[PDB]
Amino acid sequence: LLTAETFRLQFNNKRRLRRPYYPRKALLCYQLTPQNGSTPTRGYFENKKKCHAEICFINEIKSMGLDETQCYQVTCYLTWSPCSSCAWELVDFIQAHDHLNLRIFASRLYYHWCKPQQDGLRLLCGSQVPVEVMGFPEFADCWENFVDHEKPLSFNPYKMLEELDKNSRAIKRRLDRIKS
Amino acid sequence: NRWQVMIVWQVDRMRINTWKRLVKHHMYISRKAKDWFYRHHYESTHPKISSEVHIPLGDAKLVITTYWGLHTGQGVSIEWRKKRYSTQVDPDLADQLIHLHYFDCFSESAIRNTILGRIVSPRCEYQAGHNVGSLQYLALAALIKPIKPPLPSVRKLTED
Amino acid sequence: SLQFEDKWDFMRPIVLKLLRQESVTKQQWFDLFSDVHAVCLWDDKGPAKIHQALKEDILEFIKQAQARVLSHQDDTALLKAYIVEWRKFFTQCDILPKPFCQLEITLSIVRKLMLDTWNESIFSNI
Amino acid sequence: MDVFLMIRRHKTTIFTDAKESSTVFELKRIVEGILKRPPDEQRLYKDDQLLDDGKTLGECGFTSQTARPQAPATVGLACIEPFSSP
Amino acid sequence: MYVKLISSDGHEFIVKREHALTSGTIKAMLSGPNEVNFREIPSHVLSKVCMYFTYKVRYTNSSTEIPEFPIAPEIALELLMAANFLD
Amino acid sequence: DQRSKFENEEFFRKLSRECEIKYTGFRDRPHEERQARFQNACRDGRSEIAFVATGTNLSLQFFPASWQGEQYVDLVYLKAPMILNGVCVIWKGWIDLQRLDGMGCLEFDEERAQQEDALAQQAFEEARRRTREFEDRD
RNA sequence: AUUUUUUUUU
RNA sequence: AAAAAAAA
Ligand SMILES: [Zn+2]
Ligand SMILES: [Zn+2]
């Protein structure tokens, strides 16, 4: 799984990134909850060559197998949100599979100033898939979920989480105003 | 070997280009077709699909697919989809199903106002959505004659 | 234009003959159909004024029926009167709703109006 | 597409359908019998040719495109009474 | 079985019962307490109504070609009223 | 009413009449070579084949399964089950036994009609039957 | 490190 | 040259 340093660096939601100029890469943290009683299933994927994180996630969920008549709640925290090709592949996959309630949570928007990306996000919202910006609750959830806290770390996560939540207001407003 | 069979109506380049231009104009420049969708040729993994226009009707949708590399080549296909259930749809029924939700039609109290000579505000400029109905509509259309950029019609694109 | 003035009174004898199972010629039926359409079309205050007129007419007929059956307070007399009156309601619920088809188009309802009037006058009372 | 026809006997304006090349007797066997008239003492007419008596489906074989349900072609029987106008 | 609709001018149009059952007004008018008389519809409009009855009962089943009904506009308005009485 | 719908609606009457079907393709190539390409395309299902119905723009297109995602069809065995206009049908014909031309028509798919889901079918039925005209409140 | 413009401060 | 904010 992830790392505390990896979490704080790769899940940034700011528009500054300070003087150091490490690159931010799209990541997917998916979690499964079935209503039968099985434990939530946790996973994370990167933008492997060609296989964007979303597409990899789709292939993973298709390959690992699940019952068709049991409704499953899937939530994916995407670092960069889905692109237009991913916005269409995910829409098609979620229309094909009826029993999957998909919740996409984006820490920041991917080329939100371009028209096709806005249309893809509107498509995702319209086709039963609610895509919303990360706020403090999901930031904290994916913090204590997808990170091992055994190792020592600097920068108290309390501050980390509050910093991320504070950064995640302008982009929340941008997403709320981007749907039309 | 496994196959999937589906009906493609062969069209030439000019008509497909005109349909794409009209749907793009009314999606963005105009306001009638804002609720539709569009899947460009680079957003799909199908080697032959050049475009896909999605028209959401209620909880279902209508998908119009335009193809790349057929013979005697390209073509247009129409499908009606509702939660993994899909049917082939002819151009006339496609237009009729489109007109049910999107483009303005005569109001409920439109026959009466015309009967007394009163003005009727909401008309029906999408004639292609009406293919036999009732004599009231025929008389009304013969009474009032009902757009500079033509509206997107599936039957005109899928002509010949 | 011409709605409910010199028009509803024209069909009032026809309405009360249609009620109570009184013989009415077909030509009168066609005339009443035309008059109902003209009333519901020319000024459109049909599903309200025709509604009130039909409601008061059916209520008056129900009251007259109660007056004519209270003279038959005997249990056997009450039962036979109820039987013949149920035949009357069957015939009226069959025939009366048809002329007021345009009531549904604008907004039958006369059948359920008669149903609730009979429920209040008879079913609720007895 | 079978031919569609209307017969104008003065006021009466019967409407019916017939085959593309059906004989006149098939036109006036039972179809005219609705008027309670047997084939005897009855003869069809058509414009000015008068159709003679019957059995000749050649001249009576009106083309389908010439007589549509939207605009059926008159026949006549015996004068006709023209329709009124607003 | 053929019904005989009489217009306001006395012009009797005889039509098939299933063709004249298209309009709900006729279907409700006939059954109850044959032949149907009218007080307002003239001959030149009842004729068009019967023509439309035939045209619709013929072309409703068709799904490929639907030829247009030729309606003269100068009378269409009046025709509309008659249609509003029937359909 | 799916079973009855085939016998009267004109679309199926014109579609199911043993229509002549001609393969469209590499007609520019020599006829012997062209029928060789058709044979080797039918041999391994890794291409598309279109039949033009000989007179209309309507064409039946056979694409390989693995072209629109993974999610019976033969190839005298030209069985093509689909759901046309809301009713399950099978386009059946023969073109592969001959060189490059043949016959093709429609037959009812009773098995697919029974196996098809009900809610969406009646939803489409209500969508098709109803008319937009004079429906908006005013 | 997804880009452009605008505003304030040093 | 650097920091913070808003919009596309
Ligand atoms: Zn992507
Ligand atoms: Zn319309």
Residue numbers in the entry:
A (entry chain A): 3 to 182
B (entry chain 1): 3 to 74, 82 to 140, 143 to 157, 160 to 173
C (entry chain x): 12 to 118, 133 to 151
D (entry chain y): 1 to 78, 89 to 96
E (entry chain z): 17 to 49, 58 to 111
F (entry chain 0): 7 to 77, 85 to 88, 95 to 157
Can you quote the paper on this entry?
Human APOBEC3 (A3) cytidine deaminases are antiviral factors that are particularly potent against retroviruses. As a countermeasure, HIV-1 uses a viral infectivity factor (Vif) to target specific human A3s for proteasomal degradation. In this process, Vif adopts a “double-hijack” mechanism by recruiting cellular T-cell transcription cofactor CBF-β and Cullin-5 (CUL5) E3 ubiquitin ligase complex comprising CUL5, Elogin B (ELOB) and C (ELOC), and RING-box protein 2 (RBX2) to induce polyubiquitin chain formation on A3 proteins for subsequent proteasomal degradation. Vif nucleates the entire complex by directly binding four human proteins, A3H, CBF-β, CUL5, and ELOC.
The combination of K97Q A3H and N48H Vif exhibited the most significant peak shift with at least two obvious complex species, suggesting that the A3H-VCBCC complex exists in multiple stoichiometry or oligomeric states. The complex species with the largest peak shift from the mixture of K97Q A3H and N48H Vif (equivalent to peak 1 in the bottom left SEC profile in Fig. 1d) were isolated and used for the cryo-EM study. To minimize domain motion of the elongated CUL5, only the N-terminal domain was included in the CUL5 construct (CUL5-NTD). The assembled A3H/Vif/CBF-β/ELOB/ELOC/CUL5 (A3H-VCBCC) complex was resolved to a resolution of 3.2 Å. The overall complex has a butterfly-like shape with four lobes, formed respectively by A3H/RNA, Vif/CBF-β, ELOB/ELOC, and CUL5-NTD. A3H contacts Vif through its α2-α3-α4 three-helix bundle, which contains the zinc-coordinating cytidine deaminase active site. On the other hand, Vif contacts A3H with its concave side formed by the distorted five-stranded antiparallel β-sheet (β2-β6). A3H and Vif form an extensive interface with a total buried surface of 643 Å2. Interestingly, the Vif-sensitivity determining residue Q97 of A3H is indeed located in the A3H-Vif interface. Q97 forms an intermolecular hydrogen bond with K63 of Vif β3 while being stabilized by an intramolecular hydrogen bond with the S129 from the neighboring α4 of A3H. A clear feature of an A-form dsRNA is observed above the odd-numbered loops of A3H (i.e., loops 1, 3, 5, and 7) and extends away from the core of the complex.
